[PDB]
Amino acid sequence: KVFERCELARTLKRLGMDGYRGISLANWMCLAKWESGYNTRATNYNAGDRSTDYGIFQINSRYWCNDGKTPGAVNACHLSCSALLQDNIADAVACAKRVTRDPQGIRAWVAWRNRCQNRDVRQYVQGCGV
């Protein structure tokens, strides 16, 4: 599923993402936007380390979900990576929350550092009723 902007903002809000561990909804929107273009079935294989990024938040298989084909990987969200390719984003949200409970917080995603950190992200939630 490819979410429309405001539809996603409200979906994330309902799922408890607004201000989760101090992270604003606009930051989450900026992350999903640059990671997958709001596409839940987005996937990116990393030939260098044999891992794959899954879903709307492009969560990686080396540490967060199990796909059975990533060498010496772990599954911190305790989910099949398939759960990160569903139209319904609840599991992806639970996993994204798990990622941020770690030391880096939202900085775990390099894309957020490149395109969201110290940027004006107000535009992502404007007019969405959140």
From Swiss-Prot:
Gene source species: Homo sapiens
Molecular function per GO: identical protein binding; lysozyme activity
Quaternary structure and partners: Monomer.
Primary role: Lysozymes have primarily a bacteriolytic function; those in tissues and body fluids are associated with the monocyte-macrophage system and enhance the activity of immunoagents.
Location of this chain's protein in the cell: Secreted
Protein's name according to its UniProt entry: Lysozyme C
Active site: 35, 53
Origin superkingdom: Eukaryota
Disulfide bonds: 6-128, 30-116, 65-81, 77-95
Reactions accelerated catalytically: Hydrolysis of (1->4)-beta-linkages between N-acetylmuramic acid and N-acetyl-D-glucosamine residues in a peptidoglycan and between N-acetyl-D-glucosamine residues in chitodextrins
Pfam families, per the entry: Lys (PF00062)
GO-annotated biological processes: antimicrobial humoral response; defense response to bacterium; defense response to Gram-negative bacterium; defense response to Gram-positive bacterium; inflammatory response; killing of cells of another organism
